[PDB]
Structures are given as structure tokens and as C-alpha cells.
Subunit: 210 residues, 4 copies
């Protein structure tokens, strides 16, 4: 049970990594998804004299809405699995025992935020493309693949690199917003980066000396 | 008349957002401005028999010059409404009781400074228009709307995005200064952003800890 | 005597501003220079020693290049730091002034580097001339100084606007040195400012 | 023994600067095995306690390791760029087009200066825009470089802010 919580933390990290990715890029394997949802089902099973009434006190329903399947496009409906992060949020006291764990959690949450912003950025640059201004056209013109166009690997890597540059104050200049929606997204990313960057790096600066 | 203070704070935020924008861009709705003017007249009437003499020789001058009308440049003279910020300045004691209020005030003042700098940036670009050196010409050439020219939405979003990028010190490389006035303004904005960061956005973890 | 010390600080700021600029740009008003020199002579006379005499030698009969020895007047400000380090915004104002002075000196060095290779499309001066529509005599002294100061400020603040970027080995090494100096100075200045701001 | 430790530290800094430089730039297999000298820094790592007497010494050590990390990342970046140059994609071709000599191409001095300048710009979060990644390998390397550079920013200038108040 002691390692069960850490395993569940790894599983929620995995699903937070791979649910927006599948809902943004690969939407047009499932074995790992099936295994992970089975593990989450067995976890809610073990988590339940009769402490069941204590469990059904506003904490079981939020897991239930994040446990049921949606089988009956539909990536938006399986995007609801992201509610599982409340499980790792409810027991932060156990995970924050050691400073190294805190540093690992800070790095993981920064990477997760960058990944989520990358997925949102790709969605923004993809839904507008059918209507040479979008960043996908610039990406295709830069590499030797005019828009077929670049493969999904190149698009994801470029989106992640641009988001990391935006949050890290670099501003590389290869990828640069052109459309109004891209500029608004960049403004929101700048505000979010101010918040996170400041808090995370102040926290690590405090932590390192301890 | 206790929650009225936060309503007047919201109206102050509204006027500080919409007066510089109107002056900078719309010089070439009025109902909302008339409503907030009537509301501020009601407020200054409420501010009033032994207590009238107290502030009669105090804050009356500013709160009266900020509420007098000029309808009879009128648009340029309408900028006198910015004196309503002294209300928030003087009544800061009631707006600094909770950490959430402090964070909201910090975000609001950051956004307000960015908006004001965007308005000044567009003002400079407009005064330099009749003399592809300027940034408006480059923006029009790059969003596919050669100089007609970009719409007001495009110009405002571009100005706000440039100001946010430069204050945050990202420097995206889409819009860049190309005139002496623009370069001096950029130097000033860099100084303002660096001071803003090193003054407030440092130790934001400790700020939140309050 | 406090008014005298503040005026001396202002004149030191003036000479630190105007000596490197003159040496870098104006070399290939004198009345104000002579007035300030006479005022510094009367200041050392009323002070009643070696470090003051060497920096105040009248250079008569390259003189303009050799005039940089007048930049030895900031040490005099350093001695009387007790009155400058005092409660209020004076410390923050002085820190901003020295940051701007470092930016100005680096801008002068950047223009000196750019001009030494101008006679030899490659280089920031040619790019600057092309951008503002004055192909290479190209840009005026005002344009060159503003561009150099803007690039130096962007490099020190790490904005990196991308309008002006190093494109030669000399400029690249200079930008590396400015990056190191800016890291150290940014850390120091905006750590002490961020610690002072608690008052 | 006081002067001996400083001399050994200088020699360790010298070999740590030189060996990856040779391996990455002056290849033309023995150098790959010779790069095992990088583990020799464990001596300075264990004697850092002896090197932590005064704030000036630790500040200079911080600047030295900043420069060393920048140098190693520059060597790795040059190796990445050179592994794809034979097969306008990349940064070597763009650099050759910029400075004037098309791909002969730039000399070793120009290539190293460009690599170090880009590494410093990415580490210090400037992003000059003169040279930018254009391949997936380069993009991933840049992504790693931003994080390590910002971590070193936080650490070494938090230290610097600590000593300056002392
Ligand atoms: C050349 O040598 C050097 C060495 C070091 C430095 C300081 C660089 N470092 C200092 C912090 C700077 N960021 C930054 N400005 C901000 C302005 C307002 C609010 C927040 C700000 N934030 C944090 C931030 C960062 C990224 C982001 F997306 C959003 C916010 C920029 C990062 C400069 C020159």
C-alpha cells in the first residue's frame, strides 16, 4: 500500500501526459490505456468496520466521473480522465515528505504545464489552418516539407519547443505568432509563465540551500 | 453602503482600461461611460453636516475635476477621467486585507501598465504613419493586409502582445523597433519591466504565503 | 557642504556620460567642459590629493583619445559614499544610474567595435543602414548611438529583440562578454534592489 | 599544501576545458576513450569544502562552472550540428550563409565562437535570433538547454545575491 500511492502517482502522471496528446494530435496503443484504467478501477475498489460512508462523502463521486468509460469525435469525451489529478492533489502531504520529492514534483508540473500549453497551441494552429499566416505553414516552409506537410512528430516537437521558449523567456524567433488568436494565446502564456516561473524558481532557489 | 467600495473599484478599473484605449485608438459605447459618470457623481455626492467641511478642503478638488464634463480637443480632454485612480490610491487600506485581493491587484496593475504602454506604442506608431519603416507597415505586410491596412482589433492585439513580450523580456522577433522614437520607447519599457519584475514579481512565493 | 557634494556627484555623472561618448562617436561643447574643469579645480582647492591631480591634468598640445583619463572622477564619488548610502530612494536612483552608465559604456564599446570593421553586408552597421533605409556615409550619429544603446539595453535585459544581432567573430565575442557581465551585474544590482525594496 | 590545491584545481579546469573541445572539434576513436578524464573533477568536488572559505572564491568558482557548462554544451551542440551536416536544414549551413563563406565553409574558430555564443544566449534566456534550431534533434537539445540554463541561473545568482548581502 505504501508503494501503491507512488504507483498511482506515476499512473496519473502518465495519463496527464498522454490524454491531451491523444485528444489534440492523434484524433484525425490502447493496451496501456486499458491497463491503466483497470489499475485505477482496482484502486477505487481497494479504497472502498464500514468506512464506506466516509468514502461517499464528496470524495468518491469525483473519482467515479473519472473512472467510467465512454464506449457506446469521442476523444473529447475520454478527455474527462484528467480529473484523476485530484487524487494526487488530495495527498500532497504524503508526497512532500522530502525536499528532493518537492523538486521532482516542481519539475514534473512545469513540464506538464508546458506540454498542456503545447497541445493547446497545436489545436489553435490546427483548427484555423483550413481557412500563409498560420505557424504550421511557417514550420512547413522552414524545414524541407512544404504543406501532406510535416509529420506529427515534427509538429509536436516544434510546439513543445515554442512553449518552452515562451515560458523560459528565450523568444527564439524561429516560431513567432502571427494570427490574432495566436497572439492572445501568447499573452495568456506570458501571464501563466510569469506566475509559474516566478513561484517555481523562487521555491527551488529556497530549496537548494536547505 | 459598504459593498459600494468594491463597485467603485471595479468602475475605476473599467475607466482606467477604456479611457486610454478610446483616446489612443478611437480618436480617428457612450451609454456605459455615461452610466459610470453618473455613478461617480452619485459617489461624490455620497462622500458628503460636520463631515462635509472635512474633505471640502481635502480630496474634493481632484474628485470634482475628474467628474466635471467637457461636452460642448474634447476627446483629448476626456482623458481627465484618469484622476479616478486616486480613489483606489487613497482607499488602499480596505483593498489589502487578503492575499487573494493583493494578487488580484497585482495582476490588474500589471495588465493596466501593459495596456497603457500598448496605447502609447500605438500612438507613436500612428504619429509616425505619414512619414515600411514603421511597425504598422510591417504588421500590415506580415498579416497579409498591405497598406486600408490592419483593422483596429489587429493593431490593438499586436500592440498589447509586443508590450507584454518586451515587459516580460521574451522578445518574440515578429514586431521589432525600427525608428528612433520606437527604440527609445523600447528602452523605457525594458527598464519599466525589469523594475516591475525585480520589485514585485520576485519572492512571489513569499507574497502568496501571506 | 552637502549641496557641494551633490553638485560634484552630478558633474561626475555628466563627465562619465560625455567622455566615452565623445571619444567613441565624436572623435573623427568645449565651453561646458572648461567650466566643469575649472569647477573641479576650485573643488579640489576648497577640499583643503594625488588621485585628483592625475585626473585633472589639462591636456594641451591623440588629445581626444587621451582625454579618457578624466574618467577617474568616480572614485571621488566612491570615497563620499556615506552620505549617498542613506535612507530613501537615493540608493535605488544611483543603482539605476550606474546600470544605465554601464549600458552607455557598453554601447560606446559596441560602436567602437562596429566602426573598426566598417571599411573592411557583414556587421551591425551595414544591417542598420539597410533597415532604416540609409544604405552605406549612412546612418547619422544619432541613429547609430540610439541603435547601439538599444541593442546594449536589450542584451543586458535579455530581451533579445532580434533586430540587431552580432554577425562577426569580434561582435560574437563581445556579446559573450556582455552576457557574462550582464549576468553578474543583473544578479548583483537586482538582488540588492529587490532587498532594498522591503523598506 | 595550500598552493598545491589551487594548482591542481587549475589543471583540472584546463583538462575539463580541453578534452571535450578536442573530442568534438579536432576529431580529424582514441579521443573518445581519452574523454574519461572528465571524472577527475571528483577531487575538486570533494575539496569544494576547502574551496568554500570566502565568498569571492565561491563566486569565482560559480562563474568558472558556468563557463564550463557553456563550453560543454557548445561542444555537444557542435557535435549535433556536425553529425547532420553531411546529410539548408541545420545551423551550420545557415551560419555559413550568414558570415559569408558558403558550405570549405566556416573555419573551426568561427564554428566554435558561434556555438559558444548560441549556447550562452540560450543559457541566459536572450534568444538573439541570429541562429535558431531547425531540426528535431536541435529542438530537443535547445529544450534541454533552456531548462539547465534557467536552473543554473536560479542557483548561481541566488548564491550571488546571498554573498552580496554578506
Ligand atoms: C545577460 O545576462 C543576464 C542574465 C540574467 C538575466 C535575467 C533573466 N531572467 C530574469 C527574469 C526575466 N523574466 C521576467 N521578466 C519579467 C517581468 C515582469 C514579470 C515577470 C518577469 N519575468 C519572469 C518571467 C520569465 C519568463 C516568462 F515567460 C514569464 C515571466 C528574464 C529571465 C538577464 C540578463
Amino acid at each position: 500500500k505504501a508503494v501503491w500511492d507512488w504507483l498511482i502517482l506515476l499512473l496519473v502522471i502518465y495519463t496527464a501526459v498522454f490524454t491531451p496528446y491523444s485528444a489534440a494530435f492523434l484524433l484525425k496503443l490502447a493496451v496501456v490505456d486499458l491497463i491503466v484504467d483497470i489499475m485505477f478501477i482496482v484502486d477505487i475498489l481497494i479504497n472502498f468496520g464500514r468506512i464506506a460512508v466516509h468514502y461517499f462523502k464528496g470524495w468518491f463521486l469525483i473519482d467515479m466521473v473519472a473512472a467510467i468509460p465512454f464506449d457506446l469525435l469521442i476523444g473529447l469525451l475520454k478527455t474527462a480522465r484528467l480529473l484523476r489529478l485530484v487524487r494526487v492533489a488530495r495527498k500532497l502531504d504524503r508526497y512532500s515528505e522530502y525536499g528532493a520529492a518537492v523538486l521532482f514534483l516542481l519539475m514534473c508540473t512545469f513540464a506538464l504545464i508546458a506540454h498542456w500549453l503545447a497541445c493547446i497551441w497545436y489545436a489553435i494552429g490546427n483548427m484555423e489552418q483550413p481557412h500563409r499566416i498560420g505557424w504550421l505553414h511557417n514550420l512547413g516552409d522552414q524545414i524541407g516539407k512544404p504543406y501532406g506537410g510535416p509529420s506529427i512528430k515534427d509538429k509536436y516537437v516544434t510546439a513543445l519547443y515554442f512553449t518552452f521558449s515562451s515560458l523560459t523567456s528565450v523568444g527564439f524567433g524561429n516560431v513567432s505568432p502571427n494570427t490574432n488568436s495566436e497572439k492572445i494565446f501568447s499573452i495568456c502564456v506570458m501571464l501563466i509563465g510569469s506566475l509559474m516561473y516566478a513561484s517555481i524558481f523562487g521555491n527551488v532557489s529556497a530549496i537548494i540551500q536547505r
